[PDB]
Design a protein around this ligand. Sequence first.
Ligand code: NAG
Length: 92
Amino acid sequence: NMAIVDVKMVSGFIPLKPTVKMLERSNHVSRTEVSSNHVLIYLDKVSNQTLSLFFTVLQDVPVRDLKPAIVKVYDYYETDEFAIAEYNAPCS
Ligand SMILES: *[C@@H]1O[C@H](CO)[C@@H](O)[C@H](O)[C@H]1NC(C)=O
């Protein structure tokens, strides 16, 4: 019935408050938070129709080459059934 989404960041960059704040105030979002660059968006309930999420991540450390970070999505009840999906940076 319920679910949670994790997002590990590449090298070292975080987002701003008017983009993190704007996520909790939308359909299916319980809490938006970041635990040591793991940008977790706490989803409310699971649904068949597609739901899109978005925000701006500001580049701090410009020492870059080619590393795509991970995305996780496991339900709040049974954490064994999830789906991985690595995303690459816009420059890499
Ligand atoms: C989701 O999909 C199933 C069929 O795949 C459907 O029976 C159901 O009504 C849909 N919605 C919910 C809330 O389960």
